C-alpha cells in the first residue's frame, strides 16, 4: 500500500518542498517580497546566510533576547544559526521585537528546530491573526472559531 508521494521520496535523494506564495484569497494577489508596501517602493534583500552572529538578528530589525545572561548568551549564539539559513521575510518575521520569540527560552527550548520550521510557525502565527481578524469582522462565526481553535493548537504545539 504505497503512497504516490512516498513512492516518490523513496526514488529521491534531498525532497525538500519550497516556500509556496503567500496569498490573498479574496483578492487571489500573492504578497511580493521584491515590493516594499510601507514606503512604495522596489525592496531589496540582505541574503542572512553571509552576516555574522553579531549583526544578522539586528540587521533584520531584532533586538536583544529577553532572559538571564546564560540564556541570553546561548539563545543570541541559537537564534544567529537559525536566522542565517532564512530568506529575509522570515528573519524579519522571526526578529521582530515585538513577536513572539523576544525571550532566550524560546530559542534554547527549540534549538534543534529547523529554521523553516520556526519561521513558518511565526508567519503562520500572524497570518492566522489576519484571517481572525478579516473574519470577525464580516461576522462568520464559524470561522473565527475554527481560526481560534487552529491558533490555539498551533502556538500550544510550540510551547506557549
Given at each position: 500500500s504505497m503512497t504516490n508521494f512516498q513512492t516518490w521520496l523513496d526514488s529521491a535523494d534531498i525532497p525538500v518542498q519550497q516556500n509556496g506564495q503567500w496569498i490573498d484569497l479574496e483578492t487571489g494577489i500573492a504578497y511580493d517580497p521584491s515590493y516594499n508596501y510601507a514606503a512604495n517602493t522596489r525592496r531589496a534583500s540582505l541574503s542572512p546566510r553571509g552576516i555574522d552572529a553579531r549583526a544578522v538578528a539586528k540587521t533584520f530589525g531584532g533586538r536583544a533576547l529577553t532572559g538571564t545572561a546564560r540564556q541570553k548568551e546561548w539563545a543570541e549564539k541559537i537564534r544567529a544559526e537559525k536566522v542565517q539559513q532564512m530568506n529575509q521575510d522570515q528573519?524579519?518575521?522571526?526578529?521582530?521585537?515585538?513577536?513572539?520569540?523576544?525571550?532566550?527560552?524560546?530559542?534554547?527550548?527549540?534549538?534543534?528546530?529547523?529554521?523553516?520550521?520556526?519561521?513558518?510557525?511565526?508567519?503562520?502565527?500572524?497570518?492566522?491573526?489576519?484571517?481572525?481578524?478579516?473574519?470577525?469582522?464580516?461576522?462568520?462565526?464559524?470561522?473565527?472559531?475554527?481560526?481560534?481553535?487552529?491558533?490555539?493548537?498551533?502556538?500550544?504545539?510550540?510551547?506557549?
Open positions: 528573519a524579519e518575521m522571526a526578529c521582530d521585537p515585538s513577536g513572539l520569540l523576544t525571550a532566550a527560552k524560546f530559542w534554547i527550548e527549540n534549538r534543534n528546530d529547523s529554521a523553516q520550521e520556526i519561521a513558518g510557525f511565526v508567519m503562520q502565527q500572524k497570518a492566522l491573526l489576519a484571517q481572525h481578524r478579516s473574519a470577525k469582522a464580516a461576522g462568520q462565526a464559524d470561522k473565527v472559531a475554527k481560526i481560534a481553535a487552529e491558533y490555539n493548537a498551533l502556538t500550544a504545539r510550540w510551547g506557549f
